[PDB]
């Protein structure tokens, strides 16, 4: 059983720049051509073969992918970066009777900072007639990933009943997105009027607030 220690675990690079992902094998995966390979995997997609036999480039893969190394120390380089490289990269050895993978390397494309576009949604009519009520607040196409969102019910920072979700980095504009849906009851939702959605980000000292009044 061969251990593949892959470093770094995370890694951010600006567009137009090297990334140097490295692999270090516990034993030696060389037999006569060295048997390491590099894979790329975007979310929800099958992994994609970039480089076989450490340094030979698959057909169809762009030339900006290069492989080097032999024996026990291997490195992968992406010549110039494009946003289509935002994924996780793994290395594989097909040399021992128990094939092993690396820990993975999550590449993050660094773009110019970009402020989120915020929009808020009150409960629907079909929602209430069946009971219950939720307030959705979308934060779309922003950068960087770090962002915080705080709810307010009539100025009361309420924190119970929140559910968030985040998109992986967009493969075109390298932005993020998030959906926070605050869920209450029809009976508790009607006990107020003003529901606000506050979002603060690197781009602004002053948080972005989107609010509405029930009636």
């Amino acid at each position: 059983d061969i251990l593949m220690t892959q470093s770094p675990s995370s890694l951010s690079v600006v567009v137009g720049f090297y990334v140097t992902i490295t692999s270090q094998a516990s034993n030696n995966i060389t037999t006569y051509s060295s048997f390491i390979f590099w894979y790329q995997q975007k979310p929800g997609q099958a992994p994609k073969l970039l480089i076989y036999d450490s340094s030979t480039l698959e057909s169809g893969i762009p030339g900006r992918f290069s492989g080097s190394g032999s024996g026990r120390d291997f490195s992968l380089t992406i010549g110039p970066n494009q946003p289509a490289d935002g994924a996780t990269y793994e290395d594989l050895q097909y040399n021992g009777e128990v094939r092993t993978f690396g820990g993975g390397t999550k590449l993050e494309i660094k773009r110019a900072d970009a402020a989120p576009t915020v929009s808020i949604f009150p409960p629907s009519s079909e929602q209430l007639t069946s009971g219950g009520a939720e307030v959705v607040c979308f934060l779309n196409n922003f950068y960087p990933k770090n962002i915080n969102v705080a709810w307010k019910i009539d100025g009361g920072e309420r924190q119970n009943g929140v559910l968030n979700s985040w998109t992986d980095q967009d493969s075109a504009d390298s932005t993020y997105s998030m959906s926070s849906t605050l869920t209450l009851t029809k009976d508790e939702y009607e006990r107020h009027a003003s529901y606000t959605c506050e979002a603060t980000h690197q781009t602004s000292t002053s948080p972005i607030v989107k609010s509405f009044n029930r009636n």
Binding site: T31, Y32, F35, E97
Partner: protein, 364 residues
């Protein structure tokens, strides 16, 4: 003496280049037992001689000549197939690699280099002998001695492995035990020139010299193929991979592989005019013709261009011939010429095994 070496030299040649594959078919611990068992019967059969004069009469007649012919027909086909494999690889070595490959089947620079046909023009001209034998013999000793140096030095370059028992390996007692027996019969390609040779030496217990040459040739074949089968990168690669020709598991350019293929190509080239035009023409007869040469050349040419699985021919040929002269004719002749306790029962069994081998090849 000189005669053991002489017998050992003639028996070798290509025959061997298809042994690890036979073992992969049969199995590792089984193939070794097949080679031993096949080696005792083959040496035992060679004992039972005391050609055509001994196989004349008894209502059968020239049935042995056609069977003897098949052994000659297929050797010509193998060299034709083998030459293109060696000729084309020799060419691809042009000036403007310790690698083992499981080649992909189904078989500018491409298209035009592999023809097998370009080969036919030089062969047709030469097929018209004493000079070819003068040029020959010398090249067979070099090739088999070089080839066994390669098998050794390549096995030392990476061999060990082996796990006995599956995806990387192959079972030790595979069911394809009969194909190895079929390929292995031709390994004893002498049962047709011993008596025309055995008296050329000082004779008399003769028997020891005959047995020793088999043990040598038994050991030479067994030493070979074991190292190849026991050293092939089974944990990166896998068995199964060893396509019948063992050198086939080497690619486009190995300097050790290239030298060995070229010595064989030089060896076979000088042996084929002498094997066809000097031998096949005589047995058939039993600008004059120049059309019998066409059918032997043509059958092998079509074979090599089409289906060029060498072990697919060393089983049928070597096995149909073996059932014939190797085994049906010695037991019957001994029995017919007896003039029991258990000798007939033993002899009958061996006849059954010959027919079993031909039957065995048809059945997977």
């Amino acid at each position: 003496i000189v005669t053991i070496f002489a017998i050992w030299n003639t028996m070798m040649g290509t025959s061997i280049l298809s042994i690890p594959w036979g073992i992969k078919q049969a199995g590792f611990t089984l193939g070794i037992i097949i080679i031993v068992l096949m080696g005792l019967l083959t040496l035992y059969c060679c004992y039972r001689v005391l050609v055509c004069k001994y196989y004349f009469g008894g209502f059968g007649k020239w049935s042995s000549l056609v069977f003897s012919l098949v052994s000659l027909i297929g050797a010509m086909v193998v060299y034709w197939v083998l030459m293109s494999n060696f000729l084309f690889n020799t060419g691809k070595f042009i000036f403007n690699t310790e690698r083992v490959i499981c080649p992909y089947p189904d078989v500018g620079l491409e298209f035009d280099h592999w023809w097998s046909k370009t080969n036919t023009i030089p062969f047709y001209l030469i097929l018209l002998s004493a000079s070819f034998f003068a040029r020959f013999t010398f090249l067979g000793t070099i090739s088999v001695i070089y080839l066994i140096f390669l098998v050794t030095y390549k096995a030392i370059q990476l061999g060990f492995h082996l796990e006995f028992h599956s995806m990387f390996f192959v079972p030790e007692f595979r069911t394809l035990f009969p194909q190895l027996s079929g390929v292995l019969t031709l390994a004893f390609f002498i049962h047709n020139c011993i008596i025309t040779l055995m008296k050329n030496n000082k004779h008399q217990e003769n028997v020891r010299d005959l047995s020793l040459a088999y043990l040598l040739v038994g050991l030479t074949y067994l030493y070979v193929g074991v190292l190849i089968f026991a050293a092939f990168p089974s944990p990166p690669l896998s068995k199964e991979c060893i396509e019948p020709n063992f050198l086939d598991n080497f690619p486009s350019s190995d300097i050790l592989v290239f030298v060995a293929r070229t010595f064989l190509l030089f060896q076979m080239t000088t042996v084929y005019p002498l094997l066809g035009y000097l031998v096949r023409v005589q047995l058939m007869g039993q600008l004059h013709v120049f059309v019998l040469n066409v059918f032997v050349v043509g059958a092998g040419v079509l074979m090599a261009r089409f289906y060029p699985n060498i072990g697919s021919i060393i089983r049928y040929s070597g096995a149909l011939c073996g059932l014939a002269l190797v085994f049906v004719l010695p037991s019957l002749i001994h029995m017919v010429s007896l003039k029991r306790w258990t000798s007939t029962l033993f002899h009958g069994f061996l006849i059954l095994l010959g027919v079993a081998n031909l039957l065995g090849q048809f059945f997977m």
